[PDB]
Scaffold this motif. Sequence first.
Motif, short mmCIF file in Angstrom:
data_model
loop_
_atom_site.label_atom_id
_atom_site.label_comp_id
_atom_site.label_asym_id
_atom_site.label_seq_id
_atom_site.Cartn_x
_atom_site.Cartn_y
_atom_site.Cartn_z
N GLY A 242 0.93 -1.09 0.00
CA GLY A 242 0.00 0.00 0.00
C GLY A 242 0.97 1.13 0.00
O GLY A 242 1.97 1.06 0.70
N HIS A 243 0.56 2.07 -0.82
CA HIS A 243 0.43 3.38 -0.32
C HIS A 243 1.67 4.17 -0.04
O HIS A 243 2.17 4.25 1.08
CB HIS A 243 -0.44 3.39 0.94
CG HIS A 243 -1.57 4.21 0.48
ND1 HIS A 243 -2.78 3.69 0.32
CD2 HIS A 243 -1.51 5.53 0.04
CE1 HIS A 243 -3.49 4.69 -0.22
NE2 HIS A 243 -2.75 5.80 -0.40
N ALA A 244 2.03 4.83 -1.12
CA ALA A 244 2.96 5.89 -0.94
C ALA A 244 2.42 7.18 -1.53
O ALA A 244 2.99 8.24 -1.31
CB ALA A 244 4.28 5.42 -1.51
N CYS A 245 1.27 7.04 -2.21
CA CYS A 245 0.70 8.20 -2.85
C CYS A 245 0.29 9.27 -1.83
O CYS A 245 0.00 10.37 -2.19
CB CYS A 245 -0.54 7.80 -3.62
SG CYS A 245 -1.82 7.38 -2.44
N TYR A 246 0.28 8.92 -0.54
CA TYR A 246 0.01 9.95 0.47
C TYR A 246 1.10 10.03 1.50
O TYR A 246 0.95 10.72 2.49
CB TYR A 246 -1.29 9.59 1.20
CG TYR A 246 -2.45 10.49 0.88
CD1 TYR A 246 -2.40 11.48 -0.10
CD2 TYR A 246 -3.61 10.34 1.63
CE1 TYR A 246 -3.48 12.32 -0.31
CE2 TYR A 246 -4.70 11.16 1.40
CZ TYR A 246 -4.63 12.15 0.44
OH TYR A 246 -5.73 12.94 0.25
N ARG A 247 2.14 9.25 1.27
CA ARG A 247 3.30 9.37 2.11
C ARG A 247 4.31 10.29 1.49
O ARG A 247 4.27 11.49 1.62
CB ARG A 247 3.83 7.96 2.20
CG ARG A 247 3.05 7.27 3.28
CD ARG A 247 4.00 7.23 4.44
NE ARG A 247 3.23 6.61 5.48
CZ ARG A 247 3.72 5.58 6.16
NH1 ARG A 247 4.92 5.10 5.84
NH2 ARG A 247 3.02 5.05 7.14
N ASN A 248 5.30 9.67 0.85
CA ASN A 248 6.35 10.54 0.38
C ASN A 248 5.94 11.23 -0.91
O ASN A 248 6.70 12.00 -1.46
CB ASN A 248 7.65 9.79 0.20
CG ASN A 248 8.22 9.46 1.58
OD1 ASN A 248 8.30 10.27 2.49
ND2 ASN A 248 8.51 8.18 1.73
N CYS A 249 4.70 10.90 -1.35
CA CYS A 249 4.17 11.48 -2.58
C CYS A 249 4.49 12.98 -2.66
O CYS A 249 5.08 13.50 -3.61
CB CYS A 249 2.68 11.19 -2.61
SG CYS A 249 1.84 11.80 -4.07
#
Length: 22
Positions: free
Chosen positions: A1-8
């Motif tokens: 999951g999910h980096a589009c809202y982490r380091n994005c």
Amino acid sequence: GHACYRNCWREGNDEETCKERC
């Protein structure tokens, strides 16, 4: 999951930029 809202944004975008994407 999910980096589009982490380091994005941390790369070279804002906290809202990824918003419109992911």
